[PDB]
């Protein structure tokens, strides 16, 4: 679809927000890609000079994907692309308050509120949900890749590329690549399988970050044999410091051994919905 493309010239790069060994998602100014907003702040992903034509083909494919995904507020939306004479470029909304986990650290003072965590809670399970409709499937559902927006609107995001996965201790080597184990359901680590419902479980290791205030998972837990035998053995985290006991039940539900058992995005949304003062 080239009702996206947008000038080269209309664009301005700035600062780094994420990098990875071979890609970057920048901060951006956009010029005329509004008619509303003709001076508008965006986020740009691109490849590195280090990257090869596999990671272009990636590139390539996620922009696919967010083309053919229609918009959702609960999703860092696409807004424009550049594809002709240069490197690709992929344009969405710009995230005021940057990533999850960074927010929760720099408000555990003012903790910020629990009707928030409440909030980021309810936004994520729709955000899911919407994905879920589409049958994509996230894979790496973390508050690592939940970007807060003005207003406090939760922004589901994957840096992909543009995450420094070798470097970054959340992921772990396994066949050749890094994965975060701490946040995959069972069946993905040890049977290859991927699907909504191990969305699911990640998810509840979300809410758990959520409600630590940005903690470590299994803290002080190293990945090794003995912790994927505890997480075969049914082993779950304890609550939290800041979540309620109904916020705790959601969690283990999420972490239930058979994968059909989890209860879906959809059930999720009206679950904590039920928690929130508002209807
Ligand atoms: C600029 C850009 C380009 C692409 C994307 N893409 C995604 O966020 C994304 C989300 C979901 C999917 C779905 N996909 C399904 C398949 N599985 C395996 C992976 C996920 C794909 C891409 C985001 C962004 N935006 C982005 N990314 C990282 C950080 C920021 C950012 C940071 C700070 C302040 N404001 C914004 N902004």
Not at 2 to 27: H, I
Not at 139 to 153: E, P, S, Y
Not at 211 to 217: D, K, Q
Not at 232 to 239: D, E, F, L, P, V
């Amino acid at each position: 679809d080239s009702r996206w493309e947008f000038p080269r010239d209309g664009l301005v790069l700035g600062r780094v927000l994420g990098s990875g060994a071979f890609g970057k998602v920048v901060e951006g100014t956009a010029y005329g890609l509004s008619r509303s907003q003709p001076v508008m702040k965006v986020a740009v992903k691109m490849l590195k000079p280090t990257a090869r034509s596999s990671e272009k083909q990636a590139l390539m494919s996620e922009l696919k994907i967010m083309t053919h995904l229609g918009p959702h507020l609960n999703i860092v939306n696409l807004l424009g692309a550049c594809t002709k004479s240069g490197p690709i470029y992929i344009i969405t909304e710009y995230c005021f308050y940057g990533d999850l986990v960074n927010y929760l650290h720099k408000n555990r003072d003012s903790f910020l509120t629990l009707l928030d965590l409440l909030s980021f809670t309810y936004q994520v399970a729709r955000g899911m949900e919407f994905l879920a409709s589409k049958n994509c499937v996230h894979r790496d559902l973390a508050a690592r890749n939940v970007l807060l927006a003005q207003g406090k609107i939760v922004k589901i995001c994957d840096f992909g590329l543009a995450r420094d996965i070798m470097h970054d201790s959340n992921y772990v080597s396994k066949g050749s690549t890094f994965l975060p184990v701490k946040w995959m359901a069972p069946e993905s680590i040890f049977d290859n399988l991927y699907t909504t419902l191990s969305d699911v479980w990640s998810y509840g290791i979300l809410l758990w970050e959520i409600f630590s205030l940005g903690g470590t998972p299994y803290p002080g837990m190293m990945v090794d044999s003995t912790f994927y035998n505890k997480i075969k053995s049914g082993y779950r985290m304890a609550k939290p410091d800041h979540a309620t006991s109904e916020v705790y039940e959601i969690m283990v539900k999420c972490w239930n051994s058979e994968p059909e058992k989890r209860p879906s995005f959809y059930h999720l949304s009206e679950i904590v919905e039920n928690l929130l003062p508002g209807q």
